[PDB]
Amino acid sequence: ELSQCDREPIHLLGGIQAYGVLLAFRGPDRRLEVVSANTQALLGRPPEALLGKTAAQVLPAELWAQWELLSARGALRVALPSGPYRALLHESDGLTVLELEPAELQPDMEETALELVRRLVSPLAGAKGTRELLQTAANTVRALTGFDRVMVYRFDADWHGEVLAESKREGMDGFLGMHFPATDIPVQARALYTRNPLRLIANARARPVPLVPSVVPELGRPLDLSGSALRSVSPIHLEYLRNMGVEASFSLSLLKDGALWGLIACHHLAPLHLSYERRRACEVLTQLLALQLSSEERAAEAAEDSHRAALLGPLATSLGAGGTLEEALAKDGARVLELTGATGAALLLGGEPLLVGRTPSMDEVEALAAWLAPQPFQTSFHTERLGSLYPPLAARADVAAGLLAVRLAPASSRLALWFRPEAVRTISWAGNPRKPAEPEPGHARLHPRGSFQAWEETVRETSPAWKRADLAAAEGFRSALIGVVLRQAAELERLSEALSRSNAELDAFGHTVAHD
Amino acid sequence: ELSQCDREPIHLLGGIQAYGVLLAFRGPDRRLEVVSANTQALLGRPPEALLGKTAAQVLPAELWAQWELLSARGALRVALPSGPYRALLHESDGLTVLELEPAELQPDMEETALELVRRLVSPLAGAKGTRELLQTAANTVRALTGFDRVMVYRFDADWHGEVLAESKREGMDGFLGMHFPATDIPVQARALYTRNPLRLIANARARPVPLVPSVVPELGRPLDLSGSALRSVSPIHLEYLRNMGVEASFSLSLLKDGALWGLIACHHLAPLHLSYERRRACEVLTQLLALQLSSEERAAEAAEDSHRAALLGPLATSLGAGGTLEEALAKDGARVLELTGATGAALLLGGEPLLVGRTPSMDEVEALAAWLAPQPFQTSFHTERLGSLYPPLAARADVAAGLLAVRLAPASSRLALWFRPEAVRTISWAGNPRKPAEPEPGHARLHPRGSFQAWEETVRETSPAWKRADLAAAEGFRSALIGVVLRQAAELERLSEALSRSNAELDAFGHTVAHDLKEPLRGIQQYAGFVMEDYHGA
Ligand SMILES: */C=C\C1=C(C)C(=O)N/C1=C\C1=NC(=C\c2[nH]c(/C=C3\NC(=O)C(C=C)=C3C)c(C)c2CCC(=O)O)/C(CCC(=O)O)=C1C
Ligand SMILES: */C=C\C1=C(C)C(=O)N/C1=C\C1=NC(=C\c2[nH]c(/C=C3\NC(=O)C(C=C)=C3C)c(C)c2CCC(=O)O)/C(CCC(=O)O)=C1C
Known about the structure:
Chain B: GO terms for molecular function: phosphorelay response regulator activity; phosphorelay sensor kinase activity; photoreceptor activity; protein kinase activator activity. Chain B: It comes from Stigmatella aurantiaca. Chain B: It catalyses: ATP + protein L-histidine = ADP + protein N-phospho-L-histidine. Chain B: Its EC number is 2.7.13.3. The structure is a homodimer. Chain A is an alpha+beta fold. Among the domains of chain A are: 108-299, GAF domain (Beta-Lactamase), CATH 3.30.450; 319-424 and 460-498, PHY domain (Beta-Lactamase), CATH 3.30.450. Chain A contains 14 helices and 21 strands. In chain A, the strands form six sheets. Chain A has a six-stranded antiparallel beta sheet. In chain A, a hairpin with a 5-residue loop joins strand 6 (149-155) and strand 7. Chain A is elongated. At the A-B interface, helix 4, helix 8 and helix 14 of A face helix 6, helix 10 and helix 14 of B. Residues 5, 10, 151, 153, 180, 183-186, 189, 199, 233-234, 236-237, 240, 249, 251, 263, 265, 437, 446, 448 of chain B line the site of one biliverdine IX alpha (BLA). The site of one biliverdine IX alpha has 23 residues of chain A, from helix 7, strand 11 and strand 12.
């Protein structure tokens, strides 16, 4: 593929954390094909000995009494001599696997989750703004998890990320408003996190615990761990955290109708374990954030569409009065521009092209109109930097930074478009984007960024991104160009009664030659 | 416009249900001025003698210990020698009001609450549709509350509503599929329910306990009960509930966006009392359901509008393929009809109107267009019925029952409209709506309906409602219509090349006016050829 950062498989690591013990059951005969190598403390027997025997005589006597509801719903609490343990059950890779982990110790915690979900679902939330919703979710995440530093991470088109908001406690650095390279998150990571919503790495210094046996005898590969929540992450990502200085990690993915909208991040300077109940409560909390944001964007787009219609109102009303379309646009050009938020407009109906406001030279516009012919689009065209697609205008980007074009007609040569100037924008990177990874002699792998200090770069010949409202405003301008062009048709309609008058002029000079 | 069902107030009854006990406080030292008459058991002292004295000695010592957290949070579970109670505290009418209610005897209900929450939100919820979401909500509400019958009530424009889905229990009657008159819920009821979502009527035949004293001295009014959740409903609604035979009621309000879009009702045939945590858990269910309904509706409507644009596309392309607009519409008359789903399409660009599909004759549509010109509509005018508004075409309601129209020009007489035939449907009424109420002798109050048997009636000369996608499709029809108006600009240049041979004919008019003036030059030339003759004669 592109790099070792992607070709590396994540399913087949076969690494398990030291917190719990993983056990496996094979079909009806209850075969323990693969077991953890740290089961001596819990199971009281050597790990290698337990291979190949039945589940009837190996497990502690307690949890068969709890086996029924474990097979029913996959969760319970069981008492053990070492202490209270949390039991989860899931079946994957054509085999049944069982695991045990420590559980909570504060019974008062459970009602807190209900209280906080009530607070979040309570009305008047989101009216304050979209941005504050992320912070008022992150602060509650801090309270539930009790971690140190929490960011909110949002994905861009090219899979690079930004920090929309964060909530921390005093005494640590913050990455608010910082961007990160797209390659920092591998593609296989996105594919895996599409299915598994959450994950937990409570220690960074811990060595991975080997899985015995190394490979399943008949599968030919080690046991899959995607379904389990105790998987050990790749060692490469560990050095990234260690250089970052984080000891414990906890991330929850946000899903929007099949799209990885963003990730919640949590960090800690010291190792700290966390229970399954807290994880699931946090997951339930994060699930409603997508719905809240959906409601917010529906309301915002409704307001924007209403505002665009309101602005369309008087522009259409003024058109149709005394004058011609070229006269009307020239006289009423002030109200034209704000529909698309541009600085110049151009229309081509068959005559010489007409320009209003800031625009490229007269000779260039028809060259562009010809240039727009072959690119396949049906209604609209978009660009934030036309210089890539069309080099000649990149020489003078003062008005050619961004263009929005629309088909007034079918594939024939009739078009209208708008122009935008360039806006300076400066962004701050964490490390050098040019060197996302630090190479090592021997090319065994690619080490992560050496440092994490803020670094700034400036982009030029770029226009602010086209919104979604102006895309509909283009169709609105088409619906307003009708009406004014229909008044053109009405003035041509009394030119049509003047065509009846022209036939009257025909037979008028007819009876005039009759008279002379 | 207000019958007797809109005069009496609800928040000034001053009645409290049998199970509860009400207490109110005034002033920084929090003296006692309002107390229920059934407080003999819990307080152990005559109610009258305790009002106006120091609050600390009146309240039991156990309750006074946990005052601090109850003051802030407002909810608390406490233990009494009689049993376990839940204390509710709230502020209303500039007064401190606390409440005492029996507590729940079930320890682990909250785990079930979280289980139902995670069931509803789901990794994938409501993929099937809205109706399935309502059905899922109904039976979950039943399970969480343990009631017999539940309702889902949705309001129309005129505040008259029908039931969509229900969770139905065996061995008892249901109400799914009928409508209820808007008179059932008065304006005052909607105004009150706009704020308080939780309404519980523990008993139907219980008599409200009076609050001594009847009137607050400084205010001159009965103590407000809107803030509290133990209000006693008006006796007329108690009789209305008794007529059904239902004993206990539970009503949740689905306030999605500043409006009472939906009401969730629960019924039971036997006395029953719920716990406060039950109501609090059920409260978030309504918000979840409303939010998911809104999200699903928006997503589905956006997806359908995408298909509308996708169908708009090839219509525009094909219409721009041929250069005979009237003929193209005639041959492609099928396609234009399903853009808004109408059956009769009429085009009027100022010339002779074009008629395709089922439509009335030209004179009726011309008269309708003439009437539409002074009729004020900003961009569009859509209605399902026209006989109510326009008399002359009411006779021809077969095809002119409903129409959707848009204004092509900003002014004048350029209108494009469609035609829709009448659609017949049957609405089932629970009880005859023609007799909404029965008047008692003396006209003191209007008692509710007597019998609730199903009743039927038929609506006529009506068309299905123009749902918003149709209006969006008409606007998109104008938007892609500008495409065929650029094709009509090619046709405009065809009319203008007729006018261009007419402009060459205008230059012809110039030099033929020169010709028809210089033929008079030959006229005065003949006059000159005669002028020496007439001079010789003279
Ligand atoms: C190709 C390997 C590799 C390099 C080099 C690189 O840049 N990424 C990487 C390793 C992996 N990272 C994995 C996990 C992972 N990394 C991030 C990155 C961030 N952490 C932040 O808080 C932050 C900022 C903002 C970013 C962009 C994240 C979010 C993840 C997911 C899990 C958490 O770290 O929480 C990873 C996956 C391994 C596995 O799932 O076992 C790889 C391969
Ligand atoms: C004059 C008002 C009035 C007449 C007459 C009438 O038709 N109803 C009525 C009395 C009131 N009822 C009030 C509350 C109330 N009524 C209903 C009605 C229904 N219950 C159903 O199951 C159902 C169906 C649908 C209908 C039509 C409902 C749902 C409520 C809210 C509380 C519950 O009953 O659950 C009322 C409000 C004042 C008060 O609280 O006393 C009036 C005036």
